[PDB]
């Protein structure tokens, strides 16, 4: 086509989606990770994670307002990844890298798994 | 903070949101523009438009599944802007620029109004 493109549009949309999440506006699911609960938008979760894409395209699970993750999933690891989904920023640290990688593998977030493997290989 | 950032994340999220829209997955509102209907996600509309941000933060309107636009709004103009919201690409042409600008003004999409004014000024 003969379209023009606004370079910052995608980033501005994501910034607004994060603002909506922070104010709990039109959030439609709560992700339970052991003792912790995280409110989010199903569409953003599906857009970032192979696991959530599978869950919310399921004819029964698409209607659930609560999703319970595997008890082996670390809440801090999940929190770091949920923040990444809404911001493009990953808070990767020596103290959390193993939990972040295991959570990214479970959530099926290939690019996060890739940078975790690379940061781990550099430290060995 | 000491975060790393994935450059393409925002663009990949928007691409997936557009794929969900094309397959009518978790769309939660229909925008009626005279004889035409457009299914969308409320969060994306709010993230792109001052008008939809106002509508869906309203305690009564947030719960509506149908929103009827002003009868002066051109459906093709709305379609071009809805595509822009989900893609960052604006199909701006001599034959549609006046309708696109009027629709962008109504929807409160300042950056679109700005490029329309600039393209119009260049042709006079």
């Amino acid at each position: 086509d003969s379209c023009i493109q606004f370079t910052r549009h995608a980033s501005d949309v994501l910034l607004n989606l994060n603002r909506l999440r922070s104010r709990d506006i039109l959030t439609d699911v709560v992700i339970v990770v052991s003792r912790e609960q995280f409110r989010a938008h199903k569409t953003v979760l599906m857009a970032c994670s192979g696991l959530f894409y599978s869950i919310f395209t399921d004819q029964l699970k698409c209607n659930l307002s609560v999703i319970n993750l595997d008890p082996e999933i670390n809440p801090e690891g999940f929190c770091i990844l949920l923040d990444f989904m809404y911001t493009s920023r990953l808070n990767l640290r020596e103290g959390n890298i193993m939990a972040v990688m295991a959570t990214a593998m479970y959530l099926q977030m290939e690019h996060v798994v890739d940078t975790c493997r690379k940061f781990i290989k550099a430290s060995e | 903070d000491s975060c790393i950032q994935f450059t393409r994340h925002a663009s990949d999220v928007l691409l997936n949101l557009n794929r969900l829209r094309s397959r009518d997955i978790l769309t939660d509102v229909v925008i009626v523009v005279s004889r035409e209907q457009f299914r969308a996600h409320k969060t994306v509309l709010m993230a792109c438009s001052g008008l939809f941000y106002s509508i869906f933060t309203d305690q009564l309107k947030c719960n509506l599944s149908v929103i009827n636009l002003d009868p002066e709004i051109n459906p093709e103009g709305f379609c071009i802007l809805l595509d822009f919201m989900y893609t960052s690409r604006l199909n701006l042409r001599e034959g549609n620029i006046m309708a696109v600008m009027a629709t962008a003004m109504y929807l409160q999409m300042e950056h679109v109004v700005d490029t329309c004014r600039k393209f119009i000024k260049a042709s006079e």
């Binding site: 379209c3 023009i4 493109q5 606004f6 370079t7 | 690409r89 604006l90 950056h111 490029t115």
Partner: peptide, 4 residues
């Protein structure tokens, strides 16, 4: 705005 750019030509993509």
């Amino acid at each position: 705005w750019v030509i993509p």
